Scaffold this motif. Structure first.
Motif, PDB file in Angstrom:
ATOM      1  N   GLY A   1       1.504  -3.129  19.285  1.00 51.92           N
ATOM      2  CA  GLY A   1       1.307  -1.759  19.867  1.00 51.92           C
ATOM      3  C   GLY A   1       1.849  -0.727  19.147  1.00 51.92           C
ATOM      4  O   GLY A   1       2.415   0.424  20.113  1.00 51.92           O
ATOM      5  N   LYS A   2       1.837  -0.534  17.986  1.00 55.15           N
ATOM      6  CA  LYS A   2       2.448   0.653  17.347  1.00 55.15           C
ATOM      7  C   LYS A   2       1.596   0.957  16.072  1.00 55.15           C
ATOM      8  O   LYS A   2       0.885   0.322  15.632  1.00 55.15           O
ATOM      9  N   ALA A   3       1.822   1.962  15.259  1.00 53.98           N
ATOM     10  CA  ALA A   3       1.250   2.630  14.389  1.00 53.98           C
ATOM     11  C   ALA A   3       1.659   1.600  12.830  1.00 53.98           C
ATOM     12  O   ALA A   3       3.042   1.281  13.093  1.00 53.98           O
ATOM     13  N   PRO A   4       0.912   1.613  11.784  1.00 55.55           N
ATOM     14  CA  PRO A   4       1.401   0.793  10.657  1.00 55.55           C
ATOM     15  C   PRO A   4       2.378   1.811   9.991  1.00 55.55           C
ATOM     16  O   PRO A   4       2.365   3.021  10.241  1.00 55.55           O
ATOM     17  N   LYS A   5       3.189   1.111   9.239  1.00 52.71           N
ATOM     18  CA  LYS A   5       4.251   1.851   8.308  1.00 52.71           C
ATOM     19  C   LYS A   5       4.029   1.220   6.996  1.00 52.71           C
ATOM     20  O   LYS A   5       3.813   0.163   6.559  1.00 52.71           O
ATOM     21  N   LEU A   6       4.145   2.317   6.015  1.00 50.15           N
ATOM     22  CA  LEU A   6       3.924   1.967   4.717  1.00 50.15           C
ATOM     23  C   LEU A   6       5.270   1.382   4.134  1.00 50.15           C
ATOM     24  O   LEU A   6       6.259   1.799   4.441  1.00 50.15           O
ATOM     25  N   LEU A   7       5.094   0.105   3.276  1.00 50.70           N
ATOM     26  CA  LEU A   7       6.144  -0.538   2.590  1.00 50.70           C
ATOM     27  C   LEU A   7       6.352  -0.114   1.235  1.00 50.70           C
ATOM     28  O   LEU A   7       7.154   0.118   0.781  1.00 50.70           O
ATOM     29  N   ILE A   8       5.191  -0.678   0.346  1.00 46.27           N
ATOM     30  CA  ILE A   8       5.065  -0.657  -1.012  1.00 46.27           C
ATOM     31  C   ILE A   8       3.886   0.056  -1.471  1.00 46.27           C
ATOM     32  O   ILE A   8       2.837  -0.079  -0.934  1.00 46.27           O
ATOM     33  N   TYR A   9       3.935   0.989  -2.427  1.00 46.28           N
ATOM     34  CA  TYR A   9       2.852   1.395  -2.958  1.00 46.28           C
ATOM     35  C   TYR A   9       2.861   1.066  -4.539  1.00 46.28           C
ATOM     36  O   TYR A   9       4.137   1.096  -4.999  1.00 46.28           O
ATOM     37  N   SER A  10       1.659   1.291  -5.297  1.00 46.21           N
ATOM     38  CA  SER A  10       1.469   0.873  -6.518  1.00 46.21           C
ATOM     39  C   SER A  10       1.970  -0.471  -6.949  1.00 46.21           C
ATOM     40  O   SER A  10       2.017  -0.947  -8.236  1.00 46.21           O
ATOM     41  N   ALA A  11       2.037  -1.289  -5.934  1.00 41.57           N
ATOM     42  CA  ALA A  11       2.280  -2.605  -5.959  1.00 41.57           C
ATOM     43  C   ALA A  11       3.513  -3.121  -6.394  1.00 41.57           C
ATOM     44  O   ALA A  11       4.088  -4.439  -6.572  1.00 41.57           O
ATOM     45  N   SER A  12       4.403  -2.181  -6.936  1.00 40.39           N
ATOM     46  CA  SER A  12       5.785  -2.646  -7.154  1.00 40.39           C
ATOM     47  C   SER A  12       6.956  -1.495  -6.898  1.00 40.39           C
ATOM     48  O   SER A  12       8.070  -1.846  -6.718  1.00 40.39           O
ATOM     49  N   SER A  13       6.531  -0.228  -6.473  1.00 41.93           N
ATOM     50  CA  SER A  13       7.397   0.839  -6.064  1.00 41.93           C
ATOM     51  C   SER A  13       7.626   0.634  -4.600  1.00 41.93           C
ATOM     52  O   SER A  13       6.636   0.890  -3.916  1.00 41.93           O
ATOM     53  N   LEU A  14       9.062   0.726  -4.231  1.00 45.35           N
ATOM     54  CA  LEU A  14       9.538   0.802  -2.913  1.00 45.35           C
ATOM     55  C   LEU A  14       9.365   2.271  -2.396  1.00 45.35           C
ATOM     56  O   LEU A  14       9.928   3.088  -2.974  1.00 45.35           O
ATOM     57  N   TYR A  15       8.618   2.361  -1.257  1.00 44.19           N
ATOM     58  CA  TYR A  15       8.769   3.761  -0.683  1.00 44.19           C
ATOM     59  C   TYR A  15      10.177   4.083  -0.119  1.00 44.19           C
ATOM     60  O   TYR A  15      11.004   3.151   0.253  1.00 44.19           O
ATOM     61  N   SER A  16      10.356   5.264   0.012  1.00 41.84           N
ATOM     62  CA  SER A  16      11.748   5.878   0.312  1.00 41.84           C
ATOM     63  C   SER A  16      12.046   5.404   1.767  1.00 41.84           C
ATOM     64  O   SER A  16      10.964   5.638   2.887  1.00 41.84           O
ATOM     65  N   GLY A  17      13.286   4.893   2.005  1.00 43.04           N
ATOM     66  CA  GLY A  17      13.594   4.443   3.232  1.00 43.04           C
ATOM     67  C   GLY A  17      13.332   2.948   3.596  1.00 43.04           C
ATOM     68  O   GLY A  17      13.563   2.522   4.587  1.00 43.04           O
ATOM     69  N   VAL A  18      13.051   2.356   2.551  1.00 37.34           N
ATOM     70  CA  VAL A  18      12.795   0.733   2.802  1.00 37.34           C
ATOM     71  C   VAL A  18      14.014   0.014   2.312  1.00 37.34           C
ATOM     72  O   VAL A  18      14.156   0.315   1.244  1.00 37.34           O
ATOM     73  N   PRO A  19      14.258  -0.922   3.136  1.00 37.61           N
ATOM     74  CA  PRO A  19      15.369  -1.625   2.837  1.00 37.61           C
ATOM     75  C   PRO A  19      15.129  -2.426   1.359  1.00 37.61           C
ATOM     76  O   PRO A  19      13.970  -2.926   1.393  1.00 37.61           O
ATOM     77  N   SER A  20      16.116  -2.838   0.382  1.00 38.20           N
ATOM     78  CA  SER A  20      15.872  -3.243  -0.770  1.00 38.20           C
ATOM     79  C   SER A  20      16.036  -4.761  -0.719  1.00 38.20           C
ATOM     80  O   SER A  20      16.821  -5.470  -1.181  1.00 38.20           O
ATOM     81  N   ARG A  21      14.862  -5.259   0.253  1.00 40.17           N
ATOM     82  CA  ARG A  21      14.697  -6.657   0.431  1.00 40.17           C
ATOM     83  C   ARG A  21      13.263  -7.042  -0.122  1.00 40.17           C
ATOM     84  O   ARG A  21      12.979  -8.069  -0.650  1.00 40.17           O
ATOM     85  N   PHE A  22      12.284  -6.091   0.100  1.00 41.31           N
ATOM     86  CA  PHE A  22      10.808  -6.321   0.127  1.00 41.31           C
ATOM     87  C   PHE A  22      10.736  -6.153  -1.436  1.00 41.31           C
ATOM     88  O   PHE A  22      11.056  -5.033  -1.988  1.00 41.31           O
ATOM     89  N   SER A  23       9.752  -6.959  -1.999  1.00 46.60           N
ATOM     90  CA  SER A  23       9.559  -6.625  -3.323  1.00 46.60           C
ATOM     91  C   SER A  23       7.887  -6.973  -3.550  1.00 46.60           C
ATOM     92  O   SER A  23       7.407  -7.893  -2.659  1.00 46.60           O
ATOM     93  N   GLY A  24       7.146  -6.242  -4.485  1.00 47.44           N
ATOM     94  CA  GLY A  24       5.928  -6.442  -4.480  1.00 47.44           C
ATOM     95  C   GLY A  24       5.443  -6.880  -6.285  1.00 47.44           C
ATOM     96  O   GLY A  24       6.329  -6.364  -7.048  1.00 47.44           O
ATOM     97  N   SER A  25       4.531  -7.611  -6.529  1.00 53.51           N
ATOM     98  CA  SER A  25       4.174  -7.940  -7.965  1.00 53.51           C
ATOM     99  C   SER A  25       2.788  -8.346  -7.886  1.00 53.51           C
ATOM    100  O   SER A  25       2.043  -8.527  -6.852  1.00 53.51           O
ATOM    101  N   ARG A  26       2.314  -8.529  -9.061  1.00 52.03           N
ATOM    102  CA  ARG A  26       0.732  -8.148  -9.566  1.00 52.03           C
ATOM    103  C   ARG A  26       0.663  -9.037 -10.718  1.00 52.03           C
ATOM    104  O   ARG A  26       1.368  -8.520 -11.832  1.00 52.03           O
ATOM    105  N   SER A  27       0.014 -10.171 -10.845  1.00 51.14           N
ATOM    106  CA  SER A  27      -0.207 -10.948 -12.057  1.00 51.14           C
ATOM    107  C   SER A  27      -1.720 -10.494 -12.579  1.00 51.14           C
ATOM    108  O   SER A  27      -1.807 -10.195 -13.701  1.00 51.14           O
ATOM    109  N   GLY A  28      -2.531 -10.967 -11.978  1.00 53.81           N
ATOM    110  CA  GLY A  28      -3.880 -10.610 -12.018  1.00 53.81           C
ATOM    111  C   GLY A  28      -4.720  -9.518 -11.030  1.00 53.81           C
ATOM    112  O   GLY A  28      -4.358  -8.611 -10.746  1.00 53.81           O
ATOM    113  N   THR A  29      -5.587 -10.134 -10.183  1.00 57.48           N
ATOM    114  CA  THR A  29      -5.886  -9.370  -9.141  1.00 57.48           C
ATOM    115  C   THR A  29      -5.148 -10.154  -7.798  1.00 57.48           C
ATOM    116  O   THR A  29      -5.282  -9.629  -6.748  1.00 57.48           O
ATOM    117  N   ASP A  30      -4.149 -10.800  -8.132  1.00 56.52           N
ATOM    118  CA  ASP A  30      -3.539 -11.476  -7.053  1.00 56.52           C
ATOM    119  C   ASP A  30      -2.165 -10.549  -6.741  1.00 56.52           C
ATOM    120  O   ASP A  30      -1.362 -10.159  -7.724  1.00 56.52           O
TER     121      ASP A  30
END
Lengths: 216, 77, 332
Positions: A42-71
């Motif tokens: 019941g709330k609005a979405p919040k951005l976490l990660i952009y460019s598949a590796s860069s953490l948005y400002s204000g994001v706790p340093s626990r989320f990580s993103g990765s890309r191998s191919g299209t995965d």
């Protein structure tokens, strides 16, 4: 056409304190233009990660993103009771953003017309792009329309062509959706969002979505 | 543009000196000598000013100083 | 990391680069470093040459109808790569193998940045301006089969610390006094510009119109030609100041490309192939090419016949330094 961004895990047991992984698969190559979003109930979405590796400002340093191919992979090393929401996968390389199905981490006649207004403060229509999206009950996020005033171009989805026309008042810094013909699939919650200009780093800021109940 | 400006200033001065003299010196200082001399000198001076101040630099610059398949991406861990 | 790659039309030659924009500070321009790969030994003795070139191209409608165009090559460098290494070059060599060979170029300071002038509808060829290129060819004449061309762009970014407040004033006796100021000297693209104007009118005649305009000046240095002046964005107001009375106001004006598309010759940031690019960024004088500058002109049309009183304020228009490389495309 619309790049199908399939999110494999529908739900996860995700016991507290554990490492959790979510995967996203694209039909075609979207390069590294992939973003992750988090939506509490019941709330609005919040951005976490952009460019598949860069953490948005204000994001706790626990989320990580990765890309191998299209995965694309979103990994949370340490889970906390605060981190229980729905996680969405998006690509922003082509005209339809084509959000993905959610992954849950749990322990008016057609002639009728209606208009929505966005109260935006501290923003400029020429240094920003304004987006309109909708979410139906029990469905992934759907993209309705977009406007960019620096270059002066507007885009609309296939279903909303002719019956949807969005505009912006630069003086009042306001956005309008201006529904004209309301078909069956217009019962949803409508979100107003803003994005940067000359650079896309995800739909950074979101507006309080409005609940519309139309189509008989 | 500077040659045209200089030409116009010089010709304006020439005409300013010319017309008063061509009217005044018709029966006071001389009649046949001075009037004809003044008119011919004024015309010749205007023409010589035009050529000297507009075309001479061009002659200097002509004769002397003639001197003048898709891109991709890989991940290099 | 992610690096850019290109292949030869015949496919036997490959080029790897790390970046596409090379920032130019007061210090040395960021060095160009890359790798060339001849996977097969089809080159019996012919070697691979790598050239960095800078080109200046100009042409105007009158000179076109006469038939005069200006082309010049400011900077040309060549290297025989095939015959110290940064970390990226070593990693590229390790990933690729023995065939990989490194090439490096050092752009000297005081060189023009990448600028392109807005083509009209009639011209469908190469754009005019200043541009850079990296060309790798298999020559021991350049053949389209062997050679590959990659377009790079030297750019500058907004300084970290802004300067003083731009303010200017004038007085005129027949007296009348005008003064004006700007909020800051550095403005980012798409941000509104706020100007404060203040006028004191004591002469019997009043003022009837006030015009505020943003003007772009592109000084084309080489092959001497007059500079390009253009009213990018204008705001006209009907305001009257009584005799012995003052008048103060604040105006907001924003430049953008939507309304200026029809203009030909407008200076714009360097394009890779055809992508939409914003208005050009002011060059830091701190050269030999298109020098772009911006000014704002405030004019009071005094009285009846009559004349105007004007004030010009210079400001810098640039981009802040980005954490990520610009896409050089349209992001959606």
């Amino acid at each position: 056409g619309d790049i199908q961004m399939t999110q494999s895990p529908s739900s996860l047991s995700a016991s507290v304190g554990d490492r959790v992984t979510i995967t996203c698969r694209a039909s075609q190559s979207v390069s590294s233009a992939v973003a992750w979003y988090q939506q509490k109930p019941g709330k609005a979405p919040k951005l976490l990660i952009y460019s598949a590796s860069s953490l948005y400002s204000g994001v706790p340093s626990r989320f990580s993103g990765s890309r191998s191919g299209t995965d694309f992979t979103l990994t949370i090393s340490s889970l906390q009771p605060e981190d229980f929401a729905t996680y969405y996968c998006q690509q922003y390389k082509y005209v339809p953003v084509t959000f993905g199905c959610g992954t849950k981490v749990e322990i008016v006649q057609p002639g009728g017309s209606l208009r929505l207004s966005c109260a935006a403060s501290g923003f400029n229509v020429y240094s920003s792009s304004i987006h309109w999206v909708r979410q139906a009950p029990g469905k992934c996020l759907e993209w309705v329309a977009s406007i960019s005033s620096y270059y002066g171009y507007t885009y609309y989805a296939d279903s909303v062509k002719g019956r949807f026309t969005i505009s912006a008042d630069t003086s009042k810094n306001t956005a309008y959706l201006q529904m004209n013909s309301l078909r069956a699939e217009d019962t949803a919650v409508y979100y107003c969002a803003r994005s940067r200009q000359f650079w896309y780093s995800g739909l950074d800021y979101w507006g309080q979505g409005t609940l519309v109940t139309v189509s008989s | 543009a500077k040659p045209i400006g200089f030409t116009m200033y010089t010709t304006c001065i020439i005409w300013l000196a010319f017309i008063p003299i061509f009217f005044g010196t018709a029966q006071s200082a001389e009649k046949m000598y001075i009037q004809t001399t003044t008119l011919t000198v004024s015309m010749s001076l205007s023409a010589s000013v035009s050529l000297g101040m507009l075309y001479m630099p061009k002659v200097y610059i002509i004769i002397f100083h003639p001197e003048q398949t898709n891109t991709s991406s890989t991940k290099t861990t | 990391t992610r690096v850019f790659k290109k292949a030869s039309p015949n496919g036997k030659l490959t080029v790897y680069l790390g970046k596409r924009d090379f920032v130019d500070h007061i210090d040395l321009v960021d060095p160009v470093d890359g790798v060339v790969l001849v996977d097969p030994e089809y080159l019996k003795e012919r070697r691979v040459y790598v050239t960095l070139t800078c080109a200046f191209r100009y042409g105007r409608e009158d000179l076109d109808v006469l038939g005069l165009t200006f082309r010049k090559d400011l900077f040309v460098a060549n290297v025989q790569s095939f015959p110290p290494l940064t970390r990226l070059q070593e990693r590229l060599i390790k990933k690729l193998g023995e065939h990989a060979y490194p090439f490096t170029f050092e752009i000297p300071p005081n060189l023009p940045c990448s600028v392109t002038l807005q083509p009209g509808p009639e011209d469908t060829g190469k754009a005019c301006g200043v541009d850079y290129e990296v060309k790798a060819f298999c020559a021991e004449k350049i053949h389209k089969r062997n050679s590959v061309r990659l377009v790079i762009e030297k750019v500058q970014y907004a300084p970290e610390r802004p300067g003083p407040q731009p303010t200017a004033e004038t007085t005129r006796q027949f007296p009348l006094h005008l003064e004006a100021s700007l909020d800051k000297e550095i403005y980012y693209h798409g941000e509104p510009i706020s100007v404060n104007v203040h006028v004191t009118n004591n002469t019997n005649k009043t003022v009837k119109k006030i015009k505020i305009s943003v003007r772009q000046y592109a000084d084309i240095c080489l092959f001497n030609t007059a500079q390009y002046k253009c009213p990018v964005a204008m705001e006209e107001a009907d305001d009257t100041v009584a005799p012995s009375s003052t008048f103060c106001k604040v105006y907001t004006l924003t430049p953008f490309l939507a309304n200026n598309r029809e203009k030909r010759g407008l200076a714009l940031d360097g394009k890779l192939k055809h992508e939409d690019t914003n208005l050009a960024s002011s060059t830091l004088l701190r050269i030999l090419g298109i020098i772009v500058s911006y000014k704002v002109k405030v004019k009071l049309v005094v009285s009846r016949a009559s004349s105007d009183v004007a004030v010009e304020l210079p400001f810098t228009l640039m981009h802040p330094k980005p954490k990520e490389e610009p896409p050089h495309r349209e992001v959606p």
